[PDB]
Amino acid sequence: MNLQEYQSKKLMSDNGVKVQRFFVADTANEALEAAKRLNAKEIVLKAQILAGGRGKGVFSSGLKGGVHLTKDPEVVGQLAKQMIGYNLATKQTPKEGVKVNKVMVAEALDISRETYLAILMDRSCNGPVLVGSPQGGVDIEEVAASNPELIFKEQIDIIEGIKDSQAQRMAENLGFLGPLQNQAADQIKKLYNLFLKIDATQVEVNPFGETPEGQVVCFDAKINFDDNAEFRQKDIFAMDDKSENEPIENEAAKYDLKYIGLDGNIACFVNGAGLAMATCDIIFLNGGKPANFLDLGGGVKESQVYQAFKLLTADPKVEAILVNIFGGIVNCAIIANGITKACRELELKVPLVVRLEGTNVHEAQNILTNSGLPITSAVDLEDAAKKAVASVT
Amino acid sequence: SYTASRKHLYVDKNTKVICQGFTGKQGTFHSQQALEYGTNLVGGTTPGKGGKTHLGLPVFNTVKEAKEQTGATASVIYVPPPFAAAAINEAIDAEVPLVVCITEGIPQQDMVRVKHRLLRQGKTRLIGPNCPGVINPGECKIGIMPGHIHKKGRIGIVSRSGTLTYEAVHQTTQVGLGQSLCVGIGGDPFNGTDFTDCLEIFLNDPATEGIILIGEIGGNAEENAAEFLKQHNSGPKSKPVVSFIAGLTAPPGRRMGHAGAIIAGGKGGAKEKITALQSAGVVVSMSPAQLGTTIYKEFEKRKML
Ligand SMILES: Nc1nc2c(ncn2[C@@H]2O[C@H](COP(=O)(O)OP(=O)(O)O)[C@@H](O)[C@H]2O)c(=O)[nH]1
Ligand SMILES: [K+]
């Protein structure tokens, strides 16, 4: 899960992390007034979308850039009016990026040195890790490629927690000289602890900087939250608005359906995660255009089936559905019913292809065969794949 | 130390198994069936019912007791997410040679702490969390997989997806090849057993003549594995290995049904995984539907049929 920047910032603030003063607003005028209340040398306008690279993106309104520096509050409002409502397309969003409904108006600061610092559960040390680079402002992947030695890591023992030894040593590595050096250290200890507190899989600050005034500041942040931790981060998950989600998916989650909309015509719902990915795969390989990926989670239930069939069809971009389910726990029969029972109550008008296998095979093939419905039966996933494709030519 | 516990991954007819969260909806359901398959389920657990009975079986208070009273060499966990973590350490404390956590949804941080405890000991070997479990066609079944589709045989299977394993199991029985041991390592980013823990076993198990590896986007478990194969499965007496990685078409930054299936910050993509495994002489199927025939051909190319 991901929260907006102003949400992340408050959280980091509430936990002793030096962020920049800011106010949130959802209109061009609030933005203006917000620039006034701040009252500072320079202001910073930042569209609030979960994506990154905003400061290099482009709004649909024609505006270029998601982060704008200006000393004049009236400009803040003029720029805002170009952010509020439009679509921002950063190098990390789709083609039409995301629609912005809120903007952050914060106090700019001067940046002497820019450094990249981040904490994450590393799938190599199977533990928390500190990842710093004295070269900030840039996308990390890059710096890595371009100059590996410029990267510094430090495995933190999840039971001992971070140690000055580590913190200070990282601070040194980041470039923070003498006096400042210990400030960056304290801050890094802050991030780690905040990181653990909020069950975050990662907290990324870029730049983790230094001002001329000699202040260590997290000028930007990106926190990814471990979804499996919602049950003990109730307050943090309440802030997840679910506004930037593709219209559809929201619906699916209402019936606990793992939906992930792609850009295709051949919708398809499968049970089990891997088969879900596998089906998109085998579809694309055969010139297909997976319209999505759906996962009926653990077990199924005529409810889900129908529901799953309703979301998929409500989408006018679909020209076929590829059902691929492996009857393990719940036999294929109970699945077949949910399918046929839905085709009728849904009066679907898209060529449907179904591929069943496992417990109760033969029986469920009759449940379908019988219904007299236009259900195309495939022999395996290859079969289902290729056929599901022609059905949209 | 912990690598010494790989040995425990090979359950068999001798494996006596207990269930944690025994009287729960899941524990109960998969236990009635764990029986019907032929698994030696000797009892289960739940706080405050020590002495009682469930499914005609005993219900102890502690994993500790249950083991010392049934001699169970294994334990399975179906418990809800907020308690699966505790459930594992409890098995670890009671030193149960084998622990299989099925539960999906355990906070990652919790798993990191478990891995910490875990790696500094060799009595307990963990499978999971968020996995189907493990099965020795005919002799033992710990988990939630459809036992009947399996048939004792030669192919050794290790995978990060359950449904994708079933696909594989189905395919190697159609071709009449059968499975030696199937280990579903999980869909989470931090678990107690990886591809190499199993490749290690397969390679030294005479019963396993071939191996099917099933991975997907996310992490680098597939990569470390491809490395290992190059080092340990090269030579004349090398066993054939067929694989299929899932997610060649997944959009970045998205969690694909599996907390661990996600390409992030440039890492996790499927193509590297296929390029790496191939470098280690792994024969990769480009279709999840060709797992069966592919490995069938490999055994063929070596008159191993
Ligand atoms: N001078 C100055 N620049 C800033 C400030 N805040 C952000 N920026 C710059 O705005 C640029 C784009 O915002 P960014 O942090 O990249 O968010 P992103 O584009 O979504 O990744 C960054 O490269 C920063 O250097 C600030 O307070 N003062
Ligand atoms: K940034």
Burial (CB count within 10 angstroms: exposed 0-12, middle 13-18, buried 19+), residue A151: middle
Partner residue facing B288 (CB), from A123, A159, A282: A282
Contacts of B144 (CB under 8 A, 6+ apart): A328, A329, B30, B102, B132, B133, B162
CATH level 3 topology of A1-20+112-246 = D-amino Acid Aminotransferase; Chain A, domain 1 (3.30.470)
Say how far apart CA A127 and CA A129 lie, in whole Å. 6
CA distance B29 to B184: 20
What is the set of domains in chain B, with CATH numbers?
Answer: 8-130 (3.40.50.720), 131-300 (3.40.50.261)
For residue B62, give every residue at least 6 positions away whose Cβ sits within 8 Å of its Cβ, in sequence order, or none: B45, B50, B90, B94
Residues B140/B39, Cβ–Cβ less than 8 Å: yes
Q: Rg (Cα) of chain B, in Å, rounded?
A: 19
- Min Cα–Cα distance to chain A from B148, Å: 8
Class of domain A21-111 as given by CATH: alpha beta
Phi and psi at residue B189, to the nearest 5°? -75, -20
* Secondary element (H or E) of residue A5: helix A5-14
Instruction: Count how many residues are written for chain B.
Output: 305
Beta bridge partners of B74: B17, B98
Query: In whole angstroms, what is the distance from residue A64 CA to residue A55 CA?
Result: 8
A140, A216, A325, B290 from A112: Cα distances, Å: 19, 10, 57, 57
Strand partners, B157: B182, B212
- Positive/negative CA dihedral, B267, B269, B270, B276: negative
Q: What is Dmax (Cα atoms) for chain B?
A: 59
The token pair that represents B234 in the structure block: 């090269």
Of B8, B30, B54, B258, which one is the catalytic site residue? B258
Angle (CA) B124 B129 B133, round 5°:
80
Neighbours of B252 (CB within 10 A): 13
> Which technique was used to obtain these atomic coordinates?
X-ray
Q: Do A70 and A38 meet the contact criterion of CB atoms below 8 Å apart?
A: no
CA of A207 to the centre of ligand 2 (A): 7
Residue A135 carries which DSSP code? -
d(CA B132, CA B104): 10
In A198-331, which residue ranges form alpha helices assigned H by DSSP? 234-238, 247-253, 273-285, 302-314
Strands B210-216 and B152-159, sheet pairing:
parallel
Residue A386: helix, strand or coil by DSSP? helix
The radius of gyration computed from the CA coordinates of chain A, to the nearest angstrom, equals: 25
Helix (H, G, I), strand (E, B) or coil at A322: strand
Cα–Cα distance, A209 to A184 (Å, whole number)? 9
Any residues with Cβ below 6 Å from ligand 1, and which?
Answer: A 20, 44, 52-56, 66-67, 69, 108-109, 111, 137, 207, 219-220
3-state secondary structure A84-125: CCCEEECCCCCCCCEECCCEEEEECCCCCEEEEEEEEEECCC
Q: Are A368 and A340 in contact (CB under 8 A)?
A: yes
> Least CB-CB distance to A226: which of B108, B164, B253?
B108
CA B48 → CA A40, A108, A359, B77, distances in Å?
64, 60, 37, 18
d(CA B63, CA B77): 11
Return the H-helix or E-strand segment holding A154.
strand A152-155
Structure tokens at B73: 């060499």
Resolution in A: 3.0
Domain map (residue ranges) of chain A: 1-20+112-246, 21-111, 247-392
- Tokens representing residue A44 in the block: 């910073």
Task: Name the residue among B113, B116, B123 with its Cα closest to residue B84.
Answer: B113
A248 in reach of chain B (CB within 8 A): no
Identify which of A138, A388, A363, A362 has the alpha carbon closest to the alpha carbon of residue A268: A388
Given a contact cutoff of 8 angstroms between Cβ atoms, the answer to whether A221 and A203 are in contact is yes
Evaluate whether A327 touches A360 at the Cβ level (below 8 Å): yes
Contact criterion met (CB < 8 Å) for A128 and B112? yes
Q: Is A290 helix (H, G, I), strand (E, B) or coil?
A: strand
Is A19 within 8 Å of A221 (Cβ atoms)? yes
Q: Which fold has domain A247-392?
A: Rossmann fold (3.40.50)
Q: For residue A166, what are its two tokens?
A: 């580590």
d(C-alpha B51, C-alpha B53), whole Å: 7
Residues 6+ apart with CB under 8 A from A60: A86, A87, A88, A89, A96
- Distance between CA atoms of residues A185 and A171, nearest Å: 5
B195/A contact by beta carbon, under 8 A = no
Domain A1-20+112-246 identical in fold to domain A21-111: no
Amino acid letter, A359: T
Q: Is B74 an interface residue toward A (CB < 8 Å)? A: no
d(CA A296, CA A259): 9
Report how far residue B304's alpha carbon sits from residue B7's, in angstroms, rounded to the nearest whole number: 26
Q: Give all strands of the β-sheet with B133-136 in edge-to-edge order.
A: B140-143, B133-136, B179-184, B152-159, B210-216, B241-246, B283-284
Amino acid identity for residue A148 in this structure: P
Tell me the DSSP string of chain B.
-GGGGGGGG---TT-EEEEETTTSHHHHHHHHHHHHHT-EEEEEE-TT-TT-EETTEEEES-HHHHHHHH--SEEEE---HHHHHHHHHHHHHTT-SEEEE--S---HHHHHHHHHHHHT-SS-EEE-SSS-EEEETTTEEEESS-GGG--EEEEEEEES-SHHHHHHHHHHHHTT--EEEEEE--SSSS-S--HHHHHHHHHT-TT--EEEEEEESSSSHHHHHHHHHHHHS-SSSPPPEEEEEE-TTPPTT---SSTT---BTTB--HHHHHHHHHHTT-EE-SSGGGHHHHHHHHHHHTT--
Closest CA to A235 of A225, A246, A250, A248: A225
**A277–B contact, CB cutoff 8 A:** yes
| Placement of tokens 């309703």 in the chain | A310
Protein residue closest via CA to atom 23 of ligand 1: A137
